[PDB]
Design a protein around this ligand. Structure first.
Ligand SMILES: [Hg+2]
Ligand SMILES: [Hg+2]
Ligand SMILES: [Hg+2]
Lengths: 169, 169, 169, 169, 169, 169
């Protein structure tokens, strides 16, 4: 047992190790899209840069959990990073409809770790989730909301996606 | 052979002379398209500006090869530059679809030139082709691929063609 | 096929996909090290950074091939990222040594991709490697090699490790 | 016909698709001369630069008509561009002698065209050749008058030529 | 063997301990020429400077291999450096004539080495000679092609030589 | 005797020619050591950087003497530069102990050269040796004395050798 650990139950320590994989796995889906939107027969540069940023953002969430793991006394245990269930994503809107759910799923879990953190009387963990993750998830689920509403009003297909791209970019 | 020739085979020397001419046919195809898209009945300045720079880029290719001639000790022989097949290029897409194949044909003749160069072990030439021609000849093929796809998403004629041009501009 | 594709072997295309995954896992293994060295029971600030720098730039090697995959017209097949071989990477000497192996295992993989490409007669990817990989890998081998000797000189254990991590920081 | 066309007689239009190909040939003759002089065995940088900008001048003179073509509602026809009869151009003197003479032809047709212009009563056209060409050709010819006189005094073969080359450079 | 050594065939290593001594001799031949030309009775500052930087170029070319030696895990052997056969070098012309010819030998082995390189299938090595030497030697040779042509026109003995010396200076 | 010789005796003129050669043997000994300390198995950049500058300094000596040759009216005769006795210099101390004696031997040959110069009353040469050679040849002998003592205090191998190098750097 590390020299720096107190009021850190080991249950929470293990779900930090499951967020980091969920955080890791997500950033690996956002990267598949960005570069799918970089394909010649796709040629959506504005979704590409959006998801590459999503790729980078999610990768930082994971790292900021891994430093917290080292910041309470717990140990990092890095499982695999599986493959996104898909290669091709189709329209930019379909891309967005999936990112929304993954974000909810990630918000699902960030909300659950918080109540796991809460049964253990860990007000230092609840805080972490609470200025570094719980607001960035909900700004970001609201962000795709708007975006989807803008693209379907934009006319989800054809000239609407090409124009929506330019404003995204 | 003048005083400076070392490991420059005649077949590799003539194919360059060809490359000078066929890269000059292109500057001229791109020259036609540029002013066609600048006709009062056409009125596509972005399309026009693109093919202008192409013509320009493509003539620089040709002059680069000319400088490679005197460097290695060869004798430039300039050949008649042919007028383009056509005067009227239809739509911008039919000129984007036109140049892609023309950028591929050139891409083809450089690889032929590449594979003639190392069979007579002239790695200096295959240096020249790599860090100069085979590089930007793929960057521009990828480029015209993106544009054809986007323009098609945009609606290649009508309001769609008018927007894509103002982002090409 | 892709509208940009020209002279692009399917198996000179699977090797990209393959190499895409070797860098990622290396990125991931260099991620596992950077944070092992930020444990309160190893706390080696200088090895940690060094392996941070190693991770991110390994990820950029995966994204540059990703870019090249879409260029020649190929289609990105992403796979899982196997877990890192370890959790605990031992001594700072013991960390570098295994990163030496993996640099090599990547380098060796590169030299085959080159051998792959040279056989199908495609000088664009052999350019891509010689100009973006084959060099810098041999580089990353030498530094680690230099660092392993220096640390063996500095006395691999004790005050030498401590003073090495300071210079490297 | 054209939205814009007004007071544009078809023999003007036809004579311009003649001048353009005529300036494109002169522009292609100075490129021959421009590069012939960078051969290791010719090696006069001063005559080389003098013909490249010449080739570029002749070449931007051609575009000006092509553009004036689109202003007036006419239609550019681009013809084949004949390769020059010579490739071995001789003394810098003999090069200046063939220059002055190709200039005078480009003059002789541009005067001719003003006559054609004055006949089909175009005051728009008669200005264009005056304030853009006949001004520009007369000056061009008197400078080769000066140079060729200056090179015969300095000495057309030998050290005098080396010296005139530098002052040109 | 070495920590770093990978895909380094012993005939490459041996050929490099040959090129290094070969560049050190060329670097020692331009020093002879560099200083011979500052003798009171020779007294050509322009040819002197031209050979010193030559000697310095040849001399920093040698170190580059010695360094590439340490990168690849090879072992530099430094041999004796033979003093040049001549000390009295003659006309600036005769000096430029022996130059161009020592260059072509330094070329002829560096090509040879690329063949050796291509045979023992080193893509690391084939790049080094290309992007660092064969690029650098071809240019070096065409400039002495130019100079020697320029000095025969200006006159190899007498006032013409004094003049070519200054423009060189 | 050329037009500029006054009070330059042949014995004093040849000993300089020797000094040119033996100062060039040294630049080369220091050249070897520099890259040896830069080998992956050695990894001593400070030691390497020192011997580099030495090689450099020592060749400047030699070229200074070469300029003194033409000044006084002498004829440089360059002699074969011998390879160093050894390739592998053991430790840094065994190279610091190596160069000290080599800096002394040179120091010896200059004094011999000094005492040959004023016996034939050439005080200009004894000017040259004093304000140029006998000056910095003692500053550097004092320098290598300090370093051997300090490094020995430091513990000439192990953690002691690693520190001293980083202050040599
Ligand atoms: Hg817990
Ligand atoms: Hg007319
Ligand atoms: Hg080899």
């Amino acid at each position: 047992a590390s020299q720096v650990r107190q009021n850190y139950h080991e249950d929470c320590e293990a779900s930090i190790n499951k967020q980091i994989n969920m955080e890791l796995y997500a950033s690996y889906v956002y990267l598949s899209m960005a570069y799918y939107f970089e394909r010649d027969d796709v040629a959506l540069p504005g979704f590409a840069k959006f998801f590459k940023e999503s790729s980078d953002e999610e990768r930082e969430h994971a790292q900021t959990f891994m430093k917290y793991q080292n910041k309470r006394g717990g140990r990092i245990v890095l499982q695999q990073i599986a493959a996104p269930s898909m290669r091709e994503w189709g329209t930019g809107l379909e891309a967005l409809q999936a990112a929304l759910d993954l974000e909810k799923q990630v918000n699902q879990s960030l909300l659950e770790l918080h109540s796991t953190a809460s049964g253990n009387n860990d007000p230092h963990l609840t805080k972490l989730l609470e200025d570094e993750y719980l607001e960035e998830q909900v700004d970001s689920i609201k962000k795709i909301g708007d975006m989807i509403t803008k693209l379907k009003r934009a006319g989800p297909t054809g000239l609407g996606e090409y124009m929506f791209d330019k404003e995204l970019n």
